[PDB]
Amino acid sequence: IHHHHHHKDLLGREVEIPSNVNRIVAVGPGALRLIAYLKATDMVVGVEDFEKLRPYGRPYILAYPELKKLPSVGPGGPGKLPDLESLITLQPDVVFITYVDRKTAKDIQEKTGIPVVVLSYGNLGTFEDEDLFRSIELAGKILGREERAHEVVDFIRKAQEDLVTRSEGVESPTVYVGGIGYKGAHGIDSTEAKYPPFVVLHARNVVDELGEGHKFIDPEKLLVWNPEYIFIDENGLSLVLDDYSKHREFYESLSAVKRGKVYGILPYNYYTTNIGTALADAYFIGKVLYPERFTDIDPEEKADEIYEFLLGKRVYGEMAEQFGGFGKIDLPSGRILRGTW
C-alpha cells in the first residue's frame, strides 16, 4: 500500500494518483506543451505521432526534439483520442489530456486502468486565464514541479502587467491582424476580435465590433477600417503575398501599405496556445505601436528570453527560419526586414 493523493482536475473530477509519479503521457492540444513548461519532459514515456508529422509552429518541440523519438500513443491532432492499448502497454502513472469531456476522461481511465487528469487552457482571448494557471499548478503538484509551476505562472502574469504598464496613457492607434490560421492557413481575411496582444496594449482593433475570437471578414471592409498598422500572422504570409501579387491596387490603397506599416508576427495558435510566442508577439507589437515605451526591448532578444525561461532553449532563430520572424514586410518582394519596427 503506497501513499496516494486526490486531485481535482479541470472538469472537477477527483482523481486518485500515487504520490510517487515517474512516468507520464500528455495528449491533446497543448497538454505536452504544459509538461515542457514544467520541465517534466524526462518523465514522458510516449508521444503522439502529431509531434513528428506536423513539425512546425511549436517552440516546445524545437526545445525538446527528443520527444519525437518516444513510442506512439496515437496520432494526436485535434479531435483524436489516444490509443488505449498503447497506454496500457506503456503504463504511465498518469495521463494528462486536454479538450475532452467527463465521459471521455472516465472511459479512458476505466479502460486503461490509468489515472486521467483533464487540463484546460480555458479562454484563449486572454493572457491570464484562471483555468490555464490552475492546470499549470495542478500538473506541478502531481509532477513534483510546484515551485516551477508558480514561477511559470508568475512570469506570465508579470509579462502581462509589464505590457499594461508600458502602454498606460498613450493614444491608441487603429490596428488589424490578418493571416490567422483557423483549421488551415488563410490570408488577409482571417482575423481575430479581442486579440490578446492587441488587448493588453489597448490597441484599437478595427474588427472588435464583431465581439471575440476568430473572424472571417469581407476584405473590402479593410478599405473603410483603413487600419494605421497591419500585422500579418506568418502562418498566412504566403497566402497574403500571393493575394497582394494578384490584387496590388487594393493593397496599395490602404494607408498601412502606403506608410510601410505592415509587419510580420510569429504564429502562436498551433495546437492551442504557444504562450511564449504570444507574449513575444505582444512585445513586438508594443514596440511598433509605442516605440518610446519599448526603447529597452529588442523584440528578437526578448523572444529568446521568453523561450529560454519557459522552455530552456533559445528557439527564436528556428521560428524565424520557419515563418520569417519579426519585422516590416515588403509586400512586393515578400521579404521580412528583420530588426525593424
* List of residues contacting Cl ion (CB under 5 A): 59, 274, 276-277
CA neighbor of 251 nearest in space, from 171, 331, 158: 331
Compute the least distance from the CB of residue 279 to Cl ion, in Å.
8
Compute the least distance from the CB of residue 303 to Cl ion, in Å.
10
Compute the least distance from the CB of residue 310 to Cl ion, in Å.
6
How many whole angstroms separate alpha carbon 248 and alpha carbon 258? 12
Q: CB-wise, 116 or 156, nearer to Cl ion?
A: 156
Q: CB-wise, 10 or 32, nearer to Cl ion?
A: 32
Q: CB-wise, 46 or 276, nearer to Cl ion?
A: 276
Compute the least distance from the CB of residue 304 to Cl ion, in Å.
12
Give the residue nearest to Cl ion (CB): 276
Q: CB-wise, 90 or 153, nearer to Cl ion?
A: 153
DSSP 44: B
Compute the least distance from the CB of residue 106 to Cl ion, in Å.
31
CA neighbor of 222 nearest in space, from 264, 259, 174: 174
Phi-psi region of 330 (alpha: psi -120 to 50; beta: other; left: phi over 0): beta
How many whole angstroms separate alpha carbon 212 and alpha carbon 165? 24
Q: CB-wise, 57 or 92, nearer to Cl ion?
A: 57
Burial of residue 308 (CB within 10 Å: 0-12, 13-18, 19+) is: middle
Question: What's the CA angle centered on 286, arms 281 and 289, to 5 degrees?
Answer: 125
